[PDB]
Design a protein around this ligand. Structure first.
Ligand code: HEB
Ligand code: HEB
Ligand SMILES: NNC(=O)c1ccncc1
Ligand SMILES: NNC(=O)c1ccncc1
Ligand code: NA
Ligand code: NA
Ligand code: NA
Ligand code: NA
Lengths: 707, 707
């Protein structure tokens, strides 16, 4: 046969550095099986949430013969699922999280840490079958641990629904440079550089772990290094000290470690296992892997005397006893108590009249041994009421920190309360005379550059990874945002002065105006070209207050690179086009959209700094395919002027016609991008360019509109 | 930053064997930049072909300063472009060819053999700009060599238009196992196995060569090995001895080898070159690479005294002179004449008053030295008229062997003649009473299995790689097809007997009936389910005669594997699911379509051999999601029964409920496919399953309808 039917037969073997444009073309018609008028948001509403919880509760104690629930209670497992489902989230880029059901596809379905979560997912199947298209997996998975906590005795803070499902792995996510699973923090391709600093975009200490290692740093028990490790990793998943302790205690307040066997004797991870395993993994055909002779972490024992119940066991065991390293039966550093009481011994998973042992992971010990955590552990020990209130919030934050604003939240249990990390925003003045505001905007002595940049910049923060950022809420005017360099705070100030009063004058939100300012500016550059159109408009945006604005959090959204405005804050070690590709992907743009947006924003002179790189025109401020036209023109030759800069030179005359950056010239060099640049440079495609630029513009501006 | 912005950051690093489903999801909305009501077939019609040739002719002698035409004539280069554009085609799978404009994207844009074709493509740009959306690149490229031949003095047989463009590389194509360019025919990953046999699906002797090596087999001049090499490679691109000679002589009757420099001193291939090279490649910044001090093959000299003119020079030089190995200035085995005449010396590319040398490649020598080719070379020497008629056809076959049937051909120069390799088919009886034929079909004592298999099998031959195969022409009834095992010739015979007379009785083509037979059978299994529908229908199919049917050619289409009917002729070394993925891709099916088609065809008992593997039903012959339902059901466990077989067993009882093949179980193991199988197993999706199966069924049946 002659197809390329295995995954490694790619064009990525000869040119490994080459741009990964495939990440822009994800989740398209052909991969998606749903109809095209399908819409989950409206379909989920129709779901009998009441009945659903009837059945999740049901299941938690319906032990299946093919994978026996510890003590007749899957509660433990189901929480871990949801923990690990959410564990992947990182604040740098917002990627990862419970938000997509990413865990039922590779790579995550086969991470060491996600061991046996394959079973959990399958245990849920029959429910997802019963409820069908009204209950995505992403949601079902996010609920499972939450109902589990209820059934085990915790009042949880609430729940939303409305996480749409995907149908393949998120190609856009970079999980770390490692080549094998769980390596030491020094190998040829280690993610640690310098002062043992975890390179600045990742949240786990090694590949295929969720947050940290349980045997301690690099397999080497040390409660106080571990402590440090925990503090950074959780911080990068947006959790603070209080939250972190609360979560760890809260998790380990139920359930068990499983390591009562020989790890190596387990089958291959689910992506490695063969068709007979029903797409599960880590199956053990040699000996029994169910119930009691079962291995998962390699660690063995339960943190509490009653692991199917919510109680204070975790700090009671941790603070009362003294603890000491020992080795699981599978052979793993764990901590056990030095001569405890039989009463405190969790019993056996099959036969309740056999007492087994207790454990602590190195990360559990970090809670006692670290001076800062210790202070919090004490607080929850003698104030359980607080512990449970804190934890229930943190679990709910954990499981929703990536759904973005409350516009998208759905179903009966949604905290009516506004959390600061829901980046809240008022509703906007729905209706009023738009055309009037356009009128007054046009009046001001305000250039198309000024208009369009500001509008662009309010909008450019958005990212689908976790649905933060956007035009909406006009957080651009507020701190910390109005002082960011890339955001040009002088230009900004000036524009807002105008637009704030025009918005005051009109009772249309600064946001709506900031946007409409862009819109106008486009239409002006377009008309001046000769095609006159009205850009569409979505009024209704609120104006979020600085109280409801966690400024420390918003730093991860600072633009320190924006190709669309030829902005680069430093010289980074990633190429400035790789950088753009990242940005573009997070906006949710396609490759062609990315292509037009450059072409247009160049010739409208939106270039940050009043720089004129990639402004291939005499007709600056006028929406034309001029960029694409001179880019593709071989009357010119391109010369490096060092460092993200080139000179465009006439071949005959040798004079320099313009300058440009890698961001600009990537569209004339890359074969797929030059396909698009050639398209728009065609004589017959000036209307296409302009219709097209505008659709894309519009798309970006309505990026965060969940209404 | 945290995106996966370079190509090698994939899931294909941990599980290299894993199924490449990405090949099914190619050429989708997000990669495609055109509008959605765009349609090229109708848009090309509007093109001023007359003016186009005015300009191609124009260009052939408009030498550009940035890449100087040999003698003021690009003719040579432009032919080579089109040759190499078409060179990629292979008959095994139909993949490769001029048909898509695949050459302007990686990998082909950077093959060693395609060296400097990057310049050719760019030289054409301004024309493609001028004509815009009415002239795809795929067509423009296919024309360039054809107008070149005209302008140089050859009456070409004709031209079609209507090759749609792509916007990224055809991921489906496997070019060979090699890891470096042009290696020896023995390295760890060599494509040669056994008696130096080129493994049965590929048409070049090594990676990134078009057909064969010019320095001889493995760099080792031997006209008579080379000869053999040529004979097989060309045969695998569908050319016979007569055609092959004709083409080689015909090509080398104009143009030159360029090797007047230091090869190593050339820049990186276009995918390797940096943004400053304007997405060209092999640029030489150190010294001059234009005009005369120019390197391409490494060989140097011209095959004929007049290389810008069509003449008899090629055989005149080859047959009159005796020849001897020597070395280009770049250092390459070529053959030169032993003391020729100055008159016969092609002059210099810049200064016509300097005489240079002649060459022959080892493949040119193969024409003289091989006894069989020699006989043909003699024939063309003393009968130029014949040579040119033969060659013009072969060039036109070369450039159109992949466009499929003449339904798709467009524009003023199309040979009114029918060539046998256009797999011709009569027009069908457009209108007549369909419902009547349905009526009579239903009458016959003919099962849903019988109906649907036959209908499936007539249709299953189709492949988009080169648009051969399909329901149309009913070539299934004819030889060689009605004797293929997988095609079940008894069952077949029986059905046709019936359907032939029903078609005789009705004046609807056997093809239309064969299809409509399937259609009915579906509707019967569907109604019996309880959903009653009318499947759509495209009448109009002709019935091709066995005269207009090159039976040797049709062997490459024999189904020796069809998962959709659990058919496997042997035990191949590729996995039976990899095999399906290939088939599915060539049909043009998506992953979800692939998924339903299995689910349905199983339960309709279409399984080849009357086998019951993957027939998870009591209600055999009834269109239900039964397959998906029991597949996903964990009351069962799957046990290998050796060799593409498994037993589905009740966990409690240990009895065997059904059997199944890897093709069946791949949908319950693969994470992306089990996503789709779970979808269709949902309680709420029986109508979806059935609407969906039917759309897919329909798609397959109208696969070859270009009307
Ligand atoms: C929230 C929640 C949570 C959290 C946060 C956590 C956190 C954690 N964790 Fe966890 N875990 C958990 C919850 C949890 N957790 C659970 C539930 C479990 C168990 C369950 C069962 O039973 O399975 C665990 C389990 C577990 C285990 C065991 C596994 C088995 O099965 O065997 C381990 C090793 C761990 C570790 C860990 C670490 C290292 C950390 C850091 C911090 N953990
Ligand atoms: C048809 C057509 C054709 C064909 C078939 C061919 C076939 C061939 N071929 Fe060829 N070629 C050609 C056409 C051709 N051809 C041309 C046209 C040329 C050149 C052009 C120029 O001038 O560049 C060549 C060229 C050539 C060269 C040179 C390159 C440069 O530039 O330097 C070589 C080496 C060759 C080889 C060859 C071989 C080995 C073969 C096998 C067979 N090529
Ligand atoms: N390996 N882990 C288990 O088998 C399990 C854990 C928690 N509840 C039920 C089963
Ligand atoms: N390297 N080949 C050339 O430069 C060329 C060949 C044929 N016509 C024009 C230029
Ligand atoms: Na995310
Ligand atoms: Na407990
Ligand atoms: Na092809
Ligand atoms: Na000639």
């Amino acid at each position: 046969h002659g197809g390329a039917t295995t995954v490694n037969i790619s064009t990525a073997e000869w040119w490994p550095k080459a741009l990964n444009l495939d990440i822009l073309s994800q989740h398209d018609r052909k991969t998606n099986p749903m109809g095209p008028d399908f819409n989950y948001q409206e379909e989920v509403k129709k779901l009998d949430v009441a009945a659903l919880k009837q059945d999740l509760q049901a299941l938690m104690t319906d032990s299946q013969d093919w994978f026996p629930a510890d003590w007749g209670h899957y509660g433990g497992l189901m929480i871990r699922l949801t923990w690990h489902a959410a564990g992947t989230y990182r604040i740098a880029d917002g990627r990862g999280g419970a938000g997509t059901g990413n865990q039922r596809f590779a790579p995550l379905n086969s991470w060491p840490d996600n061991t046996n979560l394959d079973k959990a997912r399958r245990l849920l199947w029959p429910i997802k079958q019963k409820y069908g298209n009204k209950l995505s997996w992403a949601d079902l998975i996010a609920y499972a641990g939450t109902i589990a906590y209820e059934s085990m005795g915790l009042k949880t803070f609430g729940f939303a629904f409305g996480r749409e499902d995907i149908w393949h792995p998120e190609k856009d996510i970079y999980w770390g440079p490692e080549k094998e699973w769980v390596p030491p923090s020094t190998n040829p391709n280690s993610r640690y550089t310098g002062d043992r600093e975890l390179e600045n975009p990742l949240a786990a200490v090694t590949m295929g772990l969720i947050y940290v290692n349980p045997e301690g740093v690099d397999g080497n028990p040390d409660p106080l290094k571990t402590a440090h490790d925990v503090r950074v990793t959780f911080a990068r998943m947006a959790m603070n000290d209080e939250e972190t302790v609360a979560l760890t205690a809260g998790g380990h307040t139920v359930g068990k470690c499983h390591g009562n066997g020989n790890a190596a004797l387990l089958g291959p991870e689910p992506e490695g296992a063969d068709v007979e395993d029903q797409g599960l993994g880590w199956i053990n055909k040699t000996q029994s892997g169910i119930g009691r002779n079962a291995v998962t972490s390699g660690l063995e024992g339960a943190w509490t005397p009653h692991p199917t119940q919510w109680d204070n066991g975790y700090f009671r065991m941790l603070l009362n006893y003294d603890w000491e390293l020992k080795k699981s039966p599978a052979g793993a550093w764990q901590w056990e108590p030095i001569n405890p009481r039989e009463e405190d011994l969790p019993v056996d998973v099959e036969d309740p009249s056999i007492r087994r042992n207790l454990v602590m992971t190195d990360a559990d010990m970090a809670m006692k041994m670290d001076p800062e955590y210790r202070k919090i552990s004490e607080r929850f020990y003698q104030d359980p009421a607080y512990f449970a209130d804190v934890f229930a919030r943190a679990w709910f934050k954990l499981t929703h920190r990536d759904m973005g604003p409350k516009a998208r939240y759905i179903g009966p249990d949604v905290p009516q309360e506004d959390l600061i990390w829901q980046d809240p925003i008022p509703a906007g003045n729905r209706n009023y005379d738009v055309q009037a505001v356009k009128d007054r905007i046009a009046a001001s002595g305000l250039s198309i550059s000024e208009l369009v940049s500001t509008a662009w910049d309010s909008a450019r923060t958005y990212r689908n990874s976790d649905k933060r950022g956007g035009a909406n809420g006009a957080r651009i005017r507020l701190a910390p945002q109005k002082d960011w360099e890339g955001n040009e705070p002088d230009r900004l100030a000036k524009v807002l002065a105008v637009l704030e009063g025009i918005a005051a004058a009109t009772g249309a939100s600064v946001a709506d105006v900031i946007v409409l300012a862009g819109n106008v500016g486009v239409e002006q550059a377009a008309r001046a070209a000769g095609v006159e159109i009205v850009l569409p408009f979505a009024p209704g945006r609120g104006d979020a207050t600085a109280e409801q604005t966690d400024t420390e959090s918003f730093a991860v959204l600072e633009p320190i690179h924006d190709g669309y405005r030829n902005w680069l804050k430093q010289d980074y070690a990633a190429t400035p086009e790789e950088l753009l590709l990242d940005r573009t992907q997070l906006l949710g743009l396609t490759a062609p959209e990315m292509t037009v947006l450059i072409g247009g924003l160049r010739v409208l002179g939106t270039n940050h700094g009043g720089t004129k790189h990639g402004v291939f025109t005499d007709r600056e401020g006028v929406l034309t395919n001029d960029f694409f036209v001179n880019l593709t023109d071989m009357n010119y030759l391109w010369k490096p002027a060092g460092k993200n800069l080139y000179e465009i030179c006439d071949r005959k005359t040798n004079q320099v016609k313009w300058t440009a950056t890698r961001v600009d010239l990537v569209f004339g060099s890359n074969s797929i991008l030059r396909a698009y640049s050639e398209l728009y440079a065609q004589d017959d495609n000036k209307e296409k360019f302009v219709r097209d630029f505008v659709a894309a513009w519009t798309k970006v501006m309505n990026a965060d509109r969940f209404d």
